[PDB]
Each structure stands twice: as structure tokens, then as C-alpha cells.
Structure 1
Amino acid sequence: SHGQSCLGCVVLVSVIEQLAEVHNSSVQVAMERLCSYLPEKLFLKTACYFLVQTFGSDIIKLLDEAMKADVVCYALEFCKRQCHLYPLPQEAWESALEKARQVLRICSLPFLTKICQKIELSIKKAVPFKDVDSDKHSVFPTLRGYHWRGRDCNDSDKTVYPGRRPDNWDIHQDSNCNGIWGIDPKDGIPYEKKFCEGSQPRGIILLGDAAGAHFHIPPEWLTASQMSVNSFLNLPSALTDELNWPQLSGVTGFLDSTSGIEEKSIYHRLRKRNHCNHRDYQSISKNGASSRNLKNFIESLSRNQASDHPAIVLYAMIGNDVCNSKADTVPEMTTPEQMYANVMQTLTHLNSHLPNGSHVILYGLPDGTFLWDSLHNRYHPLGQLNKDVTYAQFFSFLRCLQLNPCNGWMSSNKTLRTLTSERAEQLSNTLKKIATTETFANFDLFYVDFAFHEIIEDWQKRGGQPWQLIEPVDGFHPNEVASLLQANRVWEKIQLQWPHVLGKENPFNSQIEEVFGDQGGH
């Protein structure tokens, strides 16, 4: 477990060294300035001052000796036997380390132990931590809260959750938190059935991985040049969301896009098309999710076979079947045979858990050689200041720490990059053939490929560069923009060939807009 600590240490000491340079300050002044930017929420600002108190004196002497973060953290025993992040010949590596020895020479608390043990299960099971009625929908934003699924309007009632069939069409209280309830004043007719009946409502559900949940570390947290108090305001919400931003993803996103592009999420297209689908979105996605381990949390899916509407399900395991952290990485890659066996088991679980009239769309896997081609000679946020860390050096560093999320594509071995894409193609064809030659009772099966090159063409006509489609910090996942151009590219395709999956526009939208408006928001 030295990798995660070693990485974290090098990240922090890097920020420290760089904040000192940006402001022409001392190492002490930088550490005080760093904590100054962090918020108090979740005790982050307290932990900062503690670490400065515990390690500050040692860090100041080492950085004053021109040592870089990687050497510092190996001297401070945060990195254990070496992995270079900055260029340095091994002879120069030994001297600096031997010079650091002559200079220098959590949840266990009984009162905090159990809540730690309680938080662990809620996340690991992919269920909201704040959920009194245990309907898996929450009134809280993060901790698997309503950022991932529609917010719960009645947290006390375990029969009230988005996607539920109208219970007597909500004469007295909103049954599915979709913002429509009550009766028509003129005629005494329930608002719900008046508006939403016969429209064939359908929900959007995501079975995906980190990319599906829009994993995103803001580069602002790592670029000292533009750091401020406003850089870390969203840090507490991010940590409690597992560094995921599903509210902004391309599938289950419901917030306005910061990126500025006009494309909207599938859920937004879904809700826009039929105001009854309001809040009928679910993000059943976890970091590291693959065809092998989806079963370990697919139970978090909340959809009752009898009391809920149909659903549009997207199976989006877009890499972890080829992307792994092992040194001998190819053996860990899922084979087409294992891919077939794992998906069929996953589909079988859905036919037993999804109401009839549902639809499942299998995503293909993209050609991840795009990662190295676009980024290998560009500078990681931690290297942008002094232009001393390229994504190539960043991939090698992570590889050394056994932390590289995709040894197959985030690699300088072209032969392996090709080998990894070939496997990604073979797995995509398996998903294609399944949708064609496999039939199920409660839903039909379709396949749309990723086709990253198509999204790049759409991006280049817009005046953008391909490297602007990848998360800057990890250089691996697609960013908010790429996710939306994909969701758009997917939505258009299903429309042109399988419009019944999405349905057809409900003409009461305007009549629902006229009467209810925002419908309680999200």
C-alpha cells in the first residue's frame, strides 16, 4: 500500500515546491498558503495544519536543498523500496537520498470507528449512506446520494421513489417524486393520469465504470500557478462522491454544463422528451467496474419488476476489461469467451429484475491508443509550471508504483498498445454478436460502438484539439465534453434505428410545463 501514499506525498510536496516558486515565497510560507486555500469541511484544513506541523520542518530542509518531491517522499519514508517522477540519473538519485539521511538523522478511535465502518459499506455496496427508508434514493447529494439517482421526496416512505408506477395516480402525495401530483381543478381528474398516462415512460440506468460516473480530478488542485481559495471549494463534495461527478455525466447528468457546449445528457434528452421521466435516472457505476466484477455491486440497482416502469439500460464497461494495473497486464485482460460468459450472466440478472418493455444497449470499447498519441509529449498539470513532467513520464511513474489504471494503453510499448486495442476490438465484437443473436423475455438487446474517432471529428470541426477530450490529471478517462459528444452520438443513433427504445414525445410536456414548471428541481 506504498503506491497510494507515495503518490499522494509526491503530489502534495510538488504543490508545495511549486506554490513557493509561483509566489517567490519560502517553503514555510507556501505550506501556510496551501492550507489557507483548503476548506474546513470534512476536517481537511485541520489535517493540513497537522501534516505541516508533523512534517513541515523536514520538508523545508529538503526542498531548500533543491530536492524534488519524489526524492523528498522517499526520504520521508512515504515511498518505500525507485520510482522517478522527474528526470534524474540514478547516480544523482543516490546522492540526494544519502544527503537526506544526514539532515533528518485513523479510523481506529473508538468514538469514530463505527461511522467509518458504516460509511465503508454504503459506498462499497453503491447505496446512499443517508437513506432512512432503505429505498436506495436519498435526500443528500453525495455519499451515493441523489447525484447518482433521482432525489427522494419522501425519505420516510419506502414506497416513494422515482420510477414507481403511479399509486392511484398520486391523488394525495407524489408517489414517484416526479413533481406531478394532485387533481385537475375544473374536472376533478388526477393530474398524473391526465398528463402521463399512455406515454410509455421509460427510465435511464447506467451500468458503467469510472468514466460512466465522470471521474474528474480538477487540475486546479494541482496547478499552483492559478491556485486560490476558490480552487478547493468543490473538494469536499468530490471526495464524498468517490471523486465522481455523475450529476454532470453524459448519461445520468442533470446539472447545467460548465464546459459550455450545448449538448445535454441522455437523461436530459429523456426528461425533455417526456416530462414524466423526471428524475428517472440511475447511475449504477463504480470505479474499476468491469464485466468481471459488475456482479459485486449490480445489486445496488433499484428497479422493482412489478411496481416500476420500464427502463433504458446502458451497459458501459468501456475499458477495465483491457485496462488493469498488473505488470504482466495481458493475462489480466478479459478474453472474448470470458466476456461472453460474464455479460450473459449480467443480462440474465436483468431479465429477472427489469420490468417488461425495457431496453438494454451495449457500449463498445474505444481504441485507447488515442491516449498515448495525444498526450505522451504534453505536460501533466504537475509538470506544466517547469515543463518537467510529460504524460509519458507520468505514465511510467504510475506504472512503477503499480498504480497505472491502464498498463495496456498508457504505455510506451507500441506493440502492447496495439495488442490492447485488438483485444478491445475483439471484446466489442463479442458485445455486438450478443445483441444480434441473443434474445430475452423482458427486453430487447442492441449494440452501439464507441467510435472515438467519430467524436474527435465532431470535436475538430468545432475548433478543438483531440487532447482536450481527456481528463488532464489522470490522462485516462474522457472528460465532461467527450462524454456528452458520445451520449449525443449514441442518442442520435438509437433514434435513427430504434426509436421505440426512447419512445415518442409526450404532447402534455407544454401542459406539464404550464402547470408545474420545474417540478421541484433535482
Structure 2
Amino acid sequence: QKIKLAIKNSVPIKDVDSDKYSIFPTLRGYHWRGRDCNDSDKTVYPGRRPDNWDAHRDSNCNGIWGVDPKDGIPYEKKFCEGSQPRGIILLGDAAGAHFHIPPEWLTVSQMSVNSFLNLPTAVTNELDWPQLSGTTGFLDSASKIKENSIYLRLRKRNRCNHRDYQNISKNGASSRNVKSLIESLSRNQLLDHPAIVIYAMIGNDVCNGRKTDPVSAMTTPEQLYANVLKMLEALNSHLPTGSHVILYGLAHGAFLWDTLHSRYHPLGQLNKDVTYTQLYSFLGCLQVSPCPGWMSANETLRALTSERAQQLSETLRKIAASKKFTNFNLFYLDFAFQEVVEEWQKMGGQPWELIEAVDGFHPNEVALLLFADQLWEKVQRQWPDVLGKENPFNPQIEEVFGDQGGH
């Protein structure tokens, strides 16, 4: 059935008007993109420019609409006319989507009834948790961390951007298949607000080759260059003028082995008989390793993997320096891994606390929000236009429209 189509194309299954925004949380629904405030109208969706300033209805789902009874001005004109709204879009991989298997599942120690309360949600989100991710999370982090996602920082900044997030990330995404993800991106070049796009394929280009020679399976600089260029041409024909595109470099995954190779996996904390070295070897034996290159005990193979990853980052940096586009400007950011570690030690944490316990590979919720924190502060200093201005009408919008309909 066409259910298969929605998941292969990473679009919601529950979406009557087929505008890619849902009233259903999971199955690529509003956990991934702003909730559709009218799933019966294809011309009502987050990110849209207001039709007649939403004097009669809320057409861009930011909760602002109607008219001020005093002067007959539409509220969205009084509160958003010059604030330069913009959306946040993530074109990412498993880390961008916040892949996460809760330790509470595999730990017999606490296997309470409350420990499996979140399972059908996780499974319907492909074990991803975009609603808690660093770029597009909107639910409160129940993790004792008061950092905010990039989207919530954009909303807090300008309450007109309410609900204008899109997490277009797929677990196995890379430069090799990003063309499919861009088809599922929603933006009308002439009818919607501009957007910030973060391209964050932080490892899959070097983390395939499960049944082959790992190095021979990795993306070459030439391949990635052509893939990303075609990627950017596509974006240029979808993104309203005045958008912004950030290319994120690849991760420094040598960190994984060094940090965990002799730490106890949660399935071995009780009996003390399992380490990540064992986990890495077990999954490598089964040819199901999420990253053979970096999860190896063979430190030459790990060195070749980091070298390729660094070579691919410099390719992305070269593209951001020498290519221009009419509808967006283009930037490059390094993987702020080192800066994330310094900031995390100050908070009394240790490095191994920044990696998913179960898979020992993806950054966890804590690290992602720290990566968002570093990106937000760095974009401010260098490229202030990318994030826009603070909107003086946040309290007033707050007083007229409350939660602005929620999420």
C-alpha cells in the first residue's frame, strides 16, 4: 500500500491535503515538522507568507492572525511585518534526527513498567527522536539539560517563526542519497518565507562498507563534490531568495574508540562482561556495524577513516568558498567536537556521557544540544544576518496568543 511510499519518501502518512505537514505526531508527522493547523487546506502550512496578513485566518500556522479591534490592523502585520521570519530546515542523518535506543530497555536492573512507555513512539519514528533533537526539538528535554534546540531559539527570538521547523533527516542519509531527501523538503520559492538549511551528513559518507573493504566503500572527494553541487542547485530552485545554507563538516569519529573501547556497555554493567570493543567486534562480525571504519580495533583503519572524513570536510569547505547562488548565501562550519568537550567538562560531565549508551556511536541528546549551542553562538558573531533580529513584540504576541496554539 502507499504507506510504503510515504516512508520511502520520508513524508507523513497522515496528511489529507498532502502538503507534508501532519496533525499526527509520529510516522514523519509533526514530531518532524511543524504541525498542520489545517490538514484540509494545501494553502495552510507552516512557513508560508501570510495571505492578506492573516486578517481572517492563520495560513502559516504561527498562531498569529485576526485584526486589532482598535485600528483594524491585522495582528501579524503589527507583530511580524518587518521581523524577517525564516524557517529552520535540517538535511541530516541519524545524528541530526537524534537516533536513540533508551538504555532503560536493555537494562534488567530497572525494567519497570514506565521504562517501556515510549516504545511505540520510538518505533513509529524509526527510532529517531527529532522532537528532542538539537536542531528541531520542541519538547522539553527531560534530561536535566536547559539548552534549547535551534528551532526553539529561533522561536524565542522571533515568535513569528512558531512551528516553522522541518527535520528532513534519514538514518542512513549521506551525500550519495540526499537528492531523495530534498524532494521531501517543503518550500515554495515565491509563496513561503526564506529558511536556514543546515546540511549535516556527519559520517555516513565514511561509515559504509559493511561487507566490503571499508576504505574502498567510502565516498571520494570527487563523488561528494558532484553530489553536493547537484544538491545545492536543487535547493536554489526551491528556497525563497534570502535563504541561508550551512554546510557542516564530518565528525571526528576517532573519538569513539578512544573514549569507549574499554568502557562497559549497559548490557554489561551488571555482570561486567561486555565492553564496546566487544560490541564493535560482535557487530563487525555480523557485518552490521554502523561504522566499520571508526568502530575498529585496527588503528590504521581508524586513521584512514579520519583522514578521508577530514578530506571530505575540506571538500565541503571549498564549495562554501568558491560557489555562489542567487537565492541563498553559503557557509561552512567545522565539527565543533573539541569545543563541545571543553564546555561539557565545565558542567561536571565526562566524554563517554556524550555518546549513546546502546549503540556507542551516535551523539546523544546532551551532545546534540551542545552542538546546537556552539553553532548558534558561532553564527551570531560571524554571520549575524543568518539568524535575524530579536522581535520586540514577543511579550505582546505572548499576551494576545499565549502558546500560539502549541506544538
Q: TM-score, normalised by structure 1?
A: 0.77
Alignment-mate amino acid for residue 486 of structure 1: F
Residues 373-412 of structure 1 aligned to structure 2 (within 5 Å): 373-412=258-297
Cα distance in 1 for residues equivalent to 2:348 and 2:185: 39
Structure 2 partner of 1:94? none
Structure 2 partner of 1:479? 364
Contact 1:379–1:390 (Cα < 8 Å) also in 2 = yes
Structure 2 partner of 1:252? 136
Alignment-mate amino acid for residue 352 of structure 1: S
Name the SS of the counterpart of 1:224 in structure 2: coil
Residue 355, structure 1, aligned to residue 240, structure 2:
yes
Residues 150-189 of structure 1 aligned to structure 2 (within 5 Å): 150-189=34-73
- Measured after TM superposition, the shift of residue 188 of structure 1 is 1.3
Q: Which has the higher contact order (CA 8 A, sep 6+)?
A: 2
Name the SS of the counterpart of 1:321 in structure 2: helix
Name the SS of the counterpart of 2:300 in structure 1: helix
* Match among 371, 386, 389 for residue 504 of structure 1: 389
Residues 372-451 of structure 1 aligned to structure 2 (within 5 Å): 372-451=257-336
- Measured after TM superposition, the shift of residue 296 of structure 1 is 2.2
Residues 124-135 of structure 1 aligned to structure 2 (within 5 Å): 124-135=8-19
Residues 284-299 of structure 1 aligned to structure 2 (within 5 Å): 284-299=168-183
Cα distance in 2 for residues equivalent to 1:328 and 1:225: 39
Name the SS of the counterpart of 1:302 in structure 2: coil
* Match among 125, 136, 153 for residue 269 of structure 1: 153
- Measured after TM superposition, the shift of residue 191 of structure 1 is 0.6
Alignment-mate amino acid for residue 171 of structure 1: A
Cα distance in 2 for residues equivalent to 1:457 and 1:332: 33
Residues 303-322 of structure 1 aligned to structure 2 (within 5 Å): 303-322=187-206
CA-to-aligned-CA distance 1:119-155 (integer Å, 9 cap, x gap): 3221111000000000000000000000000000101
Cα distance in 1 for residues equivalent to 2:257 and 2:289: 13
Cα distance in 1 for residues equivalent to 2:14 and 2:236: 29
Contact 2:98–2:129 (Cα < 8 Å) also in 1 = yes
Name the SS of the counterpart of 2:287 in structure 1: coil
Residue 240, structure 1, aligned to residue 124, structure 2:
yes
Residues 324-363 of structure 1 aligned to structure 2 (within 5 Å): 324=208, 325-363=210-248
Q: TM-score, normalised by structure 2?
A: 0.98
- Measured after TM superposition, the shift of residue 466 of structure 1 is 0.1
Residue 212, structure 1, aligned to residue 100, structure 2:
no
- Measured after TM superposition, the shift of residue 516 of structure 1 is 1.1
Name the SS of the counterpart of 2:247 in structure 1: strand
Residue 369, structure 1, aligned to residue 254, structure 2:
yes
Contact 2:336–2:374 (Cα < 8 Å) also in 1 = no
Alignment-mate amino acid for residue 332 of structure 2: Y
CA-to-aligned-CA distance 1:281-322 (integer Å, 9 cap, x gap): 000000110000111232110001011000000000000001
CA-to-aligned-CA distance 1:167-189 (integer Å, 9 cap, x gap): 11112211011101110011111
- Measured after TM superposition, the shift of residue 165 of structure 1 is 0.5
Alignment-mate amino acid for residue 342 of structure 2: E
Residue 515, structure 1, aligned to residue 400, structure 2:
yes
Contact 2:91–2:181 (Cα < 8 Å) also in 1 = no
Residue 278, structure 1, aligned to residue 168, structure 2:
no
- Measured after TM superposition, the shift of residue 507 of structure 1 is 1.2
Cα distance in 1 for residues equivalent to 2:246 and 2:197: 6
Contact 1:149–1:281 (Cα < 8 Å) also in 2 = yes
- Measured after TM superposition, the shift of residue 514 of structure 1 is 2.0
Residue 138, structure 1, aligned to residue 22, structure 2:
yes
CA-to-aligned-CA distance 1:9-43 (integer Å, 9 cap, x gap): xxxxxxxxxxxxxxxxxxxxxxxxxxxxxxxxxxx
Cα distance in 2 for residues equivalent to 1:431 and 1:469: 25
Structure 2 partner of 1:27? none
Cα distance in 1 for residues equivalent to 2:18 and 2:273: 50
Cα distance in 1 for residues equivalent to 2:4 and 2:270: 37
Name the SS of the counterpart of 1:144 in structure 2: coil
Name the SS of the counterpart of 1:431 in structure 2: helix
Name the SS of the counterpart of 2:168 in structure 1: strand
Cα distance in 2 for residues equivalent to 1:164 and 1:210: 28
Contact 1:326–1:332 (Cα < 8 Å) also in 2 = no
Residue 221, structure 1, aligned to residue 89, structure 2:
no
Cα distance in 2 for residues equivalent to 1:358 and 1:487: 19
Cα distance in 2 for residues equivalent to 1:266 and 1:280: 11
Structure 1 partner of 2:82? 198
Cα distance in 2 for residues equivalent to 1:319 and 1:326: 18
Question: Which shifted more, 128-137 or 427-436?
Answer: 427-436
Alignment-mate amino acid for residue 147 of structure 1: H
Residues 39-118 of structure 1 aligned to structure 2 (within 5 Å): 117-118=1-2
Gaps of 5+ in 2: none
Choose 1 or 2 for highest CA Rg: 1
Count the aligned residue pairs: 406
Name the SS of the counterpart of 1:314 in structure 2: strand
Question: Which shifted more, 326-335 or 154-163?
Answer: 326-335
Structure 2 partner of 1:149? 33
Cα distance in 2 for residues equivalent to 1:220 and 1:370: 25
Contact 1:327–1:402 (Cα < 8 Å) also in 2 = no
Name the SS of the counterpart of 2:184 in structure 1: coil
In the TM superposition, structure 1's runs of 4+ consecutive aligned residues that sit over 4 Å from their partners are none
